[PDB]
Design an enzyme around this catalytic site. Sequence first.
Site, PDB file in Angstrom:
ATOM      1  N   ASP A 134     130.240  79.415 121.720  1.00 21.58           N
ATOM      2  CA  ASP A 134     130.118  79.046 120.286  1.00 21.58           C
ATOM      3  C   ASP A 134     129.831  80.324 119.535  1.00 21.58           C
ATOM      4  OD1 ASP A 134     129.438  78.100 117.705  1.00 21.58           O
ATOM      5  OD2 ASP A 134     128.144  76.547 118.451  1.00 21.58           O
ATOM      6  N   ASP A 167     132.334  78.669 111.948  1.00 22.34           N
ATOM      7  CA  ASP A 167     131.537  78.196 113.084  1.00 22.34           C
ATOM      8  C   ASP A 167     132.469  77.353 113.962  1.00 22.34           C
ATOM      9  OD1 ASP A 167     128.480  76.154 113.359  1.00 22.34           O
ATOM     10  OD2 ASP A 167     129.624  77.229 114.928  1.00 22.34           O
ATOM     11  N   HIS A 195     127.144  69.963 110.107  1.00 19.85           N
ATOM     12  CA  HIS A 195     126.353  70.528 109.007  1.00 19.85           C
ATOM     13  C   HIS A 195     127.227  71.116 107.910  1.00 19.85           C
ATOM     14  CE1 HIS A 195     126.925  74.550 111.027  1.00 19.85           C
ATOM     15  NE2 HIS A 195     126.906  73.774 112.095  1.00 19.85           N
ATOM     16  N   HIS A 198     123.742  76.639 107.932  1.00 19.03           N
ATOM     17  CA  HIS A 198     123.397  75.262 107.677  1.00 19.03           C
ATOM     18  C   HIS A 198     122.938  75.156 106.230  1.00 19.03           C
ATOM     19  CE1 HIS A 198     121.709  71.283 107.866  1.00 19.03           C
ATOM     20  NE2 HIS A 198     121.946  71.168 109.160  1.00 19.03           N
ATOM     21  N   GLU A 236     130.925  69.356 114.572  1.00 17.47           N
ATOM     22  CA  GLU A 236     130.641  69.550 115.992  1.00 17.47           C
ATOM     23  C   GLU A 236     130.080  68.294 116.636  1.00 17.47           C
ATOM     24  OE1 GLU A 236     126.997  72.539 114.664  1.00 17.47           O
ATOM     25  OE2 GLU A 236     127.596  72.577 116.778  1.00 17.47           O
ATOM     26  N   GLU A 241     133.835  72.272 118.351  1.00 17.54           N
ATOM     27  CA  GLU A 241     133.423  72.473 116.949  1.00 17.54           C
ATOM     28  C   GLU A 241     134.510  73.165 116.132  1.00 17.54           C
ATOM     29  OE1 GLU A 241     129.471  74.091 114.470  1.00 17.54           O
ATOM     30  OE2 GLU A 241     130.014  75.100 116.338  1.00 17.54           O
TER      31      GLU A 241
END
Length: 368
Positions: free
Chosen positions: A142, A153, A222, A230, A254, A349
């Site tokens: 990740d 992300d 998020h 976030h 995710e 994700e």
Amino acid sequence: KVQTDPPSVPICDLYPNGVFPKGQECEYPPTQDGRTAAWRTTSEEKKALDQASEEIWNDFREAAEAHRQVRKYVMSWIKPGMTMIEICEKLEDCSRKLIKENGLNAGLAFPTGCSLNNCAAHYTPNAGDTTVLQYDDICKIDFGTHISGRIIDCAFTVTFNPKYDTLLKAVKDATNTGIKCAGIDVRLCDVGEAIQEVMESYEVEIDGKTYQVKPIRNLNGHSIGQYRIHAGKTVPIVKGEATRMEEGEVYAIETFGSTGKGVVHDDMECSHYMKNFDVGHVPIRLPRTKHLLNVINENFGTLAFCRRWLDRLGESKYLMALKNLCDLGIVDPYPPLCDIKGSYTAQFEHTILLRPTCKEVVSRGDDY
Ligand SMILES: Cc1cnccc1-c1cc(C(F)(F)F)cc2[nH]ncc12
Ligand SMILES: [Mn+2]
Ligand SMILES: [Mn+2]
């Protein structure tokens, strides 16, 4: 100009004109009335609004392309036998080259997660960590890139033993379901419930034992803000909050599937830290604490960092200073999050752009 092998040519040199490839573009899901959201594609006001933010979408796209080319390179060499440190440094070297790192204007958005087995998130090796990747390991890669604080992300799970194939499939499908269910005006709980339903429709057998795949209830997608991983809104991966997604927002979608309890607890040594986006300016006299905050401010601002990244900046004997910053609440620690000993966890994700005209899975690739 074409890309090298291994990749070493920065993404901006591959597109001299400054126009980067779009992700996957989708029509928003229909409302509860059953009415189509197709009107957004052809709307005059929405096309205008979407064009106003072109530089921004284009930044995400640059970051996303770096991400695509980085992970493709990784999938080709990641092998058991390699130390987690070796894996992270090799990924990160490539990521720096391709993102064309430039202080806070372009770089790595957060440390390379490579959480193993029962650990689901926020593990990256600190210095001296001798952990080696094993054949039976299930590894969540990740990592993040940004251009001007526009963060990608994006994450996938790496295995070598076919015994986990269905677990990975469950979670991929769950993640894709969330992405599909997501859209302007959608209730976050509804996405959560949808994700849960798909995830839990899978059963898996690992070493003569069976499980229904459980979402990790205390992990979530998020909102993403600028230099802010976030941004305040959370996306449940279980049946959640009735708050709604809004136009122009950016989301990390995710999911995590587990064969464990489906709950994570803080475990192991901490490696991930990040400045509290809400903490104002705080005068500090303590010399080593003051020095470390300065290093953090110059190098990461409000972006997450790890201890390895301090070592590489030549910092040493900083642990107490870092603890001080945590205790003062200027920095927050993000320790690894693990389900019960012996469980297996998987993750997929993507970052999505809630554009006025359409939904763009900006980080989508041929791979996932
Ligand atoms: C800041 C935050 C708040 N609530 C949940 C997760 C995170 C988070 C933290 C980091 C970290 F650890 F790098 F700060 C990376 C992340 N990727 N996706 C979410 C995420
Ligand atoms: Mn992530
Ligand atoms: Mn995330």
